[PDB]
């Protein structure tokens, strides 16, 4: 199935996933696409930050869902 990840830097990332994908798996797919290290990534769905170890199915994330990507910042 397809889900979308919207970044705050103007990209919508189109991913292929399964309900059984873990959040870590999704972050790895984002790294594949955009080069963003997983440790920087905060993935958000329906206003909540998604936790490593859970799956998309744990969060009831269905086909064509949009997730948001917020990056952790350094230097501030």
């Amino acid at each position: 199935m397809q889900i979308f990840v919207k970044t705050l830097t103007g990209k919508t990332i189109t991913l292929e996933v399964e309900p059984s994908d873990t959040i870590e798996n999704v972050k790895a797919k984002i790294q594949d696409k955009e080069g963003i290290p997983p440790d920087q990534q905060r993935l958000i769905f329906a206003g909540k930050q998604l936790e490593d170890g859970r799956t998309l199915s744990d969060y009831n994330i269905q086909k064509e869902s949009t997730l948001h990507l917020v990056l952790r910042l350094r230097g501030g």
């Binding site: 705050l8 905060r42 206003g47 909540k48 917020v70």
Partner: protein, 45 residues
């Protein structure tokens, strides 16, 4: 400002929160949206 109102809309979309809450997180983070969202998702512990 128009620009700040747009930031509030975007913050509230990501956080799925009320506009007033978004505005205060933004203002308290110097109107820096990614910083404000980091604060929102990892508050003081």
């Amino acid at each position: 400002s128009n620009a700040r109102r747009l930031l509030c809309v975007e913050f509230a979309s990501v956080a799925s929160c009320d506009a007033a809450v978004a505005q205060c997180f933004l203002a308290e983070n110097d109107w820096e949206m990614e910083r404000a969202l980091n604060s929102y998702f990892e508050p003081p512990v």
